[PDB]
Amino acid sequence: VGSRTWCESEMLFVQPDAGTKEELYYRVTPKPGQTQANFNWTPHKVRFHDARPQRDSFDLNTHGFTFVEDAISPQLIERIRADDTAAVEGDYFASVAALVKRVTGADHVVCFSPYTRKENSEKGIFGQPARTVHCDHTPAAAIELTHKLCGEDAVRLLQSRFRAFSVWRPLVEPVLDWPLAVVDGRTIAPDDLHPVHWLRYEKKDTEPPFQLSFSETQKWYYLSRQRSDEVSIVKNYDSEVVPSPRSAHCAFKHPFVPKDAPPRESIDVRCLVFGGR
Ligand SMILES: COC(=O)[C@@H]1C(=O)C(C)=C2O[C@@]3(C[C@]2(C)[C@H]1C)[C@@H](C)CC[C@H]1C(C)(C)OC(=O)CC[C@@]13C
Ligand SMILES: O=C(O)CCC(=O)C(=O)O
Ligand SMILES: [Fe+3]
């Protein structure tokens, strides 16, 4: 079940054969009598390798994720846990953009779609830890978001280095239960990827994310006891041919944490990233 540097748990995947017929969709809040989806989630046991002993070795080009030290003030953290929207869209966005610029050297970073999560929250499923394995954007979705956020400039930006990240930070520390797991992007096979339309509304309203199916080839990691000063950057899209075009991520129930541990709290923000290395 566990050893010094790994543990075992489960996550929700899609079937390897999902989406070979029609487009997959999942309704977030289906009405009575409405069909919720044309596929089922399937749990699979996964071995989670602790990234802690090799923390500084993981790289956004090689692995599709990286961990970076970046302390923020206790007051910004309490403002965020208080759902202070102005603190998120102002101070925290600025913090994330600046962090991403240190890490990559990018010329331009655009933050969007922040989600503050709390273990079995009341703000719905996007305010709760993610239980299905996903990559936030397909290429089409990343391209669409660049047009939507960057206007005219997109015609030039989309032809050089373009990346999209999820930037994830614990708001209570250390994280014990429901840690964010990330996969070595070199171990994702193209057939593991399944676009799924998340219907927040009656109709498709954006381009979709990828949901993953399980494979024994996938090498899954987690950073044990992650602190509020330790930020996970998880790559959802990259225009450059690098060993990991993307990673994928999801939370899992940790087998060795006490039942009565406090709820996990975190904030994640997506970012479009232009230029850099
Ligand atoms: C339990 O829900 C999760 O596990 C994930 C989640 O928590 C969130 C917040 C999501 O946002 C998505 C899809 C995921 C990754 C889901 C799978 C949808 C639901 C709304 C925002 C869009 C958007 C920003 C328009 O960009 C897109 O490319 C389309 C997909 C996302 C990123
Ligand atoms: O906090 C979680 O459980 C999921 C976070 C996430 O999906 C993201 O950062 O894109
Ligand atoms: Fe995500």
Residue numbers in the entry: 2 to 278
Lines from the paper:
NvfI from Aspergillus novofumigatus IBT 16806 is an endoperoxidase that catalyzes the formation of fumigatonoid A in the biosynthesis of novofumigatonin. Our biosynthetic analysis of novofumigatonin revealed that the Fe(II)/α-KG-dependent enzyme NvfI accepts asnovolin A (2) as a substrate and introduces three oxygen atoms, including an endoperoxide bridge and C-3’-hydroxyl group, to generate fumigatonoid A.12 Sequence and phylogenetic analyses of the NvfI homologs and characterized Fe(II)/α-KG-dependent enzymes in secondary metabolite biosynthesis indicated that NvfI shares low sequence similarity (10–15% amino acid identity) and belongs to a different clade from FtmOx1. The active site of NvfI is located in the DSBH core and an Fe is coordinated by the His135-His137-Asp250 triad, which is conserved in α-KG-dependent oxygenases. Further, the crystallographic analysis reveals significant conformational changes of two loops upon substrate binding, which suggests a dynamic movement of active site during the catalytic cycle.
